[PDB]
Design a protein around this ligand. Structure first.
Ligand SMILES: Nc1ncnc2c1ncn2[C@@H]1O[C@H](CSCC[C@H](N)C(=O)O)[C@@H](O)[C@H]1O
Ligand SMILES: [Zn+2]
Lengths: 179, 97, 352, 107, 80, 94
């Protein structure tokens, strides 16, 4: 109160999304249709499917708002389609900036960047007993990265997958070395 | 001291209500229900009396037929007590949901 | 953006609203009520600004002055008072024939007010003293005349219950231009209201055969006396046949809104092409009273059974106002950034 | 004696208005048929036709095809909610079904 | 108004179930039955009010109810 | 030389080339679309005829067609069909 000059004045963070509230078949993505029939309806569903909140595990995490069923699509990981040597400049650059690595490679050629450009598939934490996984699919020649599911997921439960250093996952099947 | 074994008064009420022909719902609460759920379509409507009597006849007949088909589902599952999943099975085989 | 689409709440604060108007900048909203109360809201803050008790009998007409500091009304009690927004005191009051339709200031001067009585002729007044000039009426047989100033203030258009529009000069009463509206084949129709735009010369005539005609303010000055112009645009509804109640223009005089007297809807047309662009429905069994339009922003204020609704664009937000260095894309975008991979200006700060 | 302009062009439609007006006059519906009724009805029929052909063309694109066969009409109708309620008691020939296996049947 | 779906009490559903021929009833049937009845009544009331608005009236007569039910696929003798 | 058969093939083909400019259609799908247009025509026309008989009129106007569309189509689909019909009549008059 105007005199007690204290610490905790700087945090060096890009997102101030950590809020006070943090309130954490029929559909085409769940049907047995071919792949571009599901991929078209994906982006219309993913706006109301999930959201990002304050994760107790590590920073922020992805929290659903509706019962994801088993084996369906959830969200697409999409950002800058960069190549695998600008990743080295950006790793050293955000080593100098202190910002972590957001680099999924589609194959052994190109990498998707999710630092300057992307969507809400950044905020998915790591775990050891997950409930999601990924594949690489083919929609009209181009390739995409889809986060599927593994079982029926209840409203409020956090979504995690294996990324493939001490971690805050805390699962019983932990490895404690993530490389 | 005297009490009937449970089931006896149920069977004789079945016979008593299948013998008569009357309305089995009170009619001032049903009239209030009709006016309330008609209020969300047009403000200040003005019903007759035979309109409300026709709606009550039709609603009673619909619910009695639904309970007959529900009872057949519950007997098919080798039970006696009717549960709401029997109602769901009846309304989905029939073509309503 | 443009013309509104979504319902966007209400103002259920004071019951029994009856009429409404905006000022030149669209920051205030004066509404008369059923017991002589004039409640002013705000749209900059979305709150009630000032409540002034006017009379005991209801208010059916309101008009803002040019500076915005003076109101005027015409209640059932034949009372026309130049009110105050600061003090709120009645100054002038004198009786008329008992029905009164409309009052309106001069669009450049807050000295001249144009009162339209029901069973009389138009009377142009002054406010420096108690003068009154009864304007001439051609027919003098029905005595059902509506009139209004034009945009700048140079002329006054008058209309009768026989479809004969006259043009009088605003100060010397010069009957210089006139026409009779070509209604169907032979029969003539009434005139209900005359309204003017905010930018340009166009205006609209609300007749009684349920057709709205959009004219041009210069073709009348070209044709002169007893000419025969034809409308630029004829707007109507033929499915429900829709007898209209109130009309006005958009912000820059581009779109036209027209409320209905039967079904509580709002129809919006274009002026240039002339096609129907949107119908805005609402509560199914109400009755419509007044339609407004915000002069620089798409807001419509419809009074119906004392409830004022505001159709206001449904603002839906995003990221990148929080994190300006990030671009929230939708699908993948491939590129590389660059083809080479690695003054004394004194400006017045207190100028208004 | 002027240039003939069909009533479809005057309203901005693609379905015919003269044929709909004839089929209302020669169909034993009423004695007298108004002026705006075939214009209204041709507008409604064009809207429903475009609404179903949009979804059928999308399914035909997703199956790596160019043309439209009855399977794509089947998928388009049965996936939408309100087209399914409209065409509920209707069998489309050469159409098939939707993939649906119950939960308690797979291990 | 928030009530009047509660006004369909719970000896009345019992009497309808016994005219249907039912011996033993659970305790969730009550809310399930109230939902069923509200859906049916909404679908009939909507078409009756449509016929009334087209006729340019303000009262719902018995014939509008009969015509609505006849559209549903449920004929009703005795009120025409 | 055969006897002529009126259909709706060319008009469905016009609507398809508005909405998807590089897509064709086979014969059986065109037959299904022809049957669909005839079915919906007969439903709406029969309901409008029955309304005009209930109210003791001799005329099918556009208001009976509007009420028949509102009775017969479900929800938002009726909400958009009413708009399309009203817009076409408004463009036809002027
Ligand atoms: N479960 C977990 N426990 C500890 N660290 C984790 C973790 N999940 C992810 N991380 C680390 O956090 C980074 C992911 S971004 C973490 C969420 C978000 N950026 C936020 O904190 O607001 C990665 O570099 C990873 O090393
Ligand atoms: Zn860990």
């Amino acid at each position: 109160a105007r005199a007690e000059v204290h610490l905790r004045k700087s945090a060096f963070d890009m997102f101030n999304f950590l809020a006070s509230k943090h309130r954490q078949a029929r559909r085409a993505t769940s049907m047995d249709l071919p792949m571009p029939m599901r991929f078209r309806h994906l982006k219309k569903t993913s706006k109301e499917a999930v959201g990002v909140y304050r994760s107790p595990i590590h920073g922020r995490g992805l929290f659903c708002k509706r019962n994801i069923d088993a084996g369906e699509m959830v969200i697409e990981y999409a950002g800058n389609v960069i190549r695998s040597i600008q990743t080295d400049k950006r790793e050293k650059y955000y080593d100098s900036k202190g910002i972590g690595c957001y680099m999924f490679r589609i194959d052994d050629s190109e990498v998707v960047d999710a630092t300057m450009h992307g969507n809400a598939a950044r905020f998915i934490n790591h775990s050891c007993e997950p409930n999601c996984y990924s594949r690489v699919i083919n929609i009209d020649g181009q390739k995409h990265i889809v986060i599927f599911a593994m079982r029926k997921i209840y409203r409020g439960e956090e979504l995690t997958y294996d990324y493939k250093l001490p971690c805050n996952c805390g699962a019983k099947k932990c490895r404690k070395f993530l490389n | 001291p005297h009490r009937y074994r449970p089931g006896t008064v149920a069977l004789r009420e079945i016979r008593r209500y299948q013998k008569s022909t009357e309305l089995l719902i009170r009619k001032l609460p049903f009239q209030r229900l009709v006016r309330e759920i008609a209020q969300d379509f047009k403000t200040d409507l003005r019903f007759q009396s035979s309109a409300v009597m026709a709606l009550q006849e039709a609603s009673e007949a619909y619910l009695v037929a639904l309970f007959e088909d529900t009872n057949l589902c519950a007997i098919h599952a080798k039970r006696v007590t009717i549960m709401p999943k029997d109602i769901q099975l009846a309304r989905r085989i029939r073509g309503e949901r | 953006q443009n013309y509104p689409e979504e319902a966007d709440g209400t103002l259920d604060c004071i019951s029994m609203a009856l009429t409404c108007t905006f000022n030149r900048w669209g920051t205030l909203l004066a509404v008369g009520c059923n017991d002589g109360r004039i409640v002013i809201w705000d749209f900059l803050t979305r709150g009630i600004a000032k409540i002034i008790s006017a009379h005991i009998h209801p208010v059916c007409s309101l008009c803002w002055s040019r500076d915005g500091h003076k109101l005027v009304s015409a209640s059932t009690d034949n009372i026309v008072s130049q009110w105050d927004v600061l003090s709120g005191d009645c100054d002038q009051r004198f009786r008329f024939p008992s029905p009164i339709l409309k009052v309106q200031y001069h669009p450049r001067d807050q000295n001249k007010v144009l009162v339209c009585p029901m069973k009389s002729a138009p009377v142009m007044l002054t406010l420096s003293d108690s003068k009154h000039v009864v304007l001439p009426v051609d027919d003098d047989s029905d005595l059902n005349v509506v009139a209004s100033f034009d945009r700048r203030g140079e002329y006054i258009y008058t209309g009768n219950a026989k479809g004969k529009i006259l043009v009088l000069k605003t100060d010397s009463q010069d009957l210089v231009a006139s026409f009779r509206v070509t209604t169907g084949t032979s029969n003539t129709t009434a005139i209900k209201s005359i309204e003017f735009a905010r930018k340009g010369s166009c205006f609209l005539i609300n007749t009684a055969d349920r057709i709205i005609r959009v004219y041009d303010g210069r073709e009348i000055l070209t044709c002169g006396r007893d000419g025969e112009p034809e409308p630029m645009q004829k707007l109507q509804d033929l499915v429900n046949r829709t007898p209209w109640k109130k009309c006005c223009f958009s912000g820059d005089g581009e779109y036209i809104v027209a409320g209905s007297a039967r079904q509580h809807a709002l129809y919006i047309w274009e002026k240039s092409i002339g096609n129907l662009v949107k119908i805005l429905h609402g509560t199914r069994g109400e009755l419509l009273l007044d339609v407004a339009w915000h002069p620089v922003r798409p807001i419509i204020a419809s009074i119906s059974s004392g409830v004022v609704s505001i159709w206001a664009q449904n603002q839906v937000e995003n990221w990148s106002a929080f994190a300006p260095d990030f671009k929230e894309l939708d699908e993948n975008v491939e590129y590389e950034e660059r083809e080479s991979e690695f003054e004394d200006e004194e400006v017045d700060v207190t100028s208004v | 004696r002027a240039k003939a302009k069909t009533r479809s062009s005057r309203a901005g439609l693609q379905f015919p208005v003269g044929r709909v007006h004839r089929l209302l006059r020669k169909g034993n519906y009423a004695e007298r048929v108004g002026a705006g009724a075939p214009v209204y009805l041709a507008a409604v029929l064009e809207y429903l036709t475009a609404e179903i052909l949009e979804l059928a063309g999308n399914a035909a694109r997703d199956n790596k095809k160019t043309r439209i066969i009855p399977r794509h009409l089947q998928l388009a109708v049965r996936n939408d909610e309100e087209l399914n309620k409209l065409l509920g008691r209707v069998t489309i020939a050469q159409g098939g079904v939707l993939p649906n296996i119950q939960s308690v049947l797979l291990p | 108004l928030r009530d009047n779906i509660q006004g369909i009490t719970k000896p009345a559903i019992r009497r309808l179930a016994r005219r249907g021929g039912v011996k033993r009833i659970s305790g969730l049937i009550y809310e399930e039955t109230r939902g069923v009845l509200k859906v049916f009544l909404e679908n009939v009331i909507r078409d009756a009010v449509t016929y009334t608005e087209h006729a340019k009236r303000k009262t719902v007569t018995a014939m509008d109810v009969v015509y609505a039910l006849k559209r549903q696929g449920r004929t009703l003798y005795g009120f025409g | 030389r055969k006897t002529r058969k009126e259909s709706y093939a060319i008009y469905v083909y016009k609507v398809l080339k508005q909405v998807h400019p590089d897509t064709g259609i086979s014969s059986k799908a065109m037959s299904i679309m022809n049957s669909f247009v005839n079915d919906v025509f007969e439903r709406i026309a029969g309901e409008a005829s029955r309304l005009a008989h209930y109210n003791k009129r001799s005329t099918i106007t556009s208001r009976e067609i509007q009420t028949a569309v509102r009775l017969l189509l479900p929800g938002e689909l009726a909400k958009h069909a009413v708009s399309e019909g009203t817009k076409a009549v408004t463009c036809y008059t002027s």
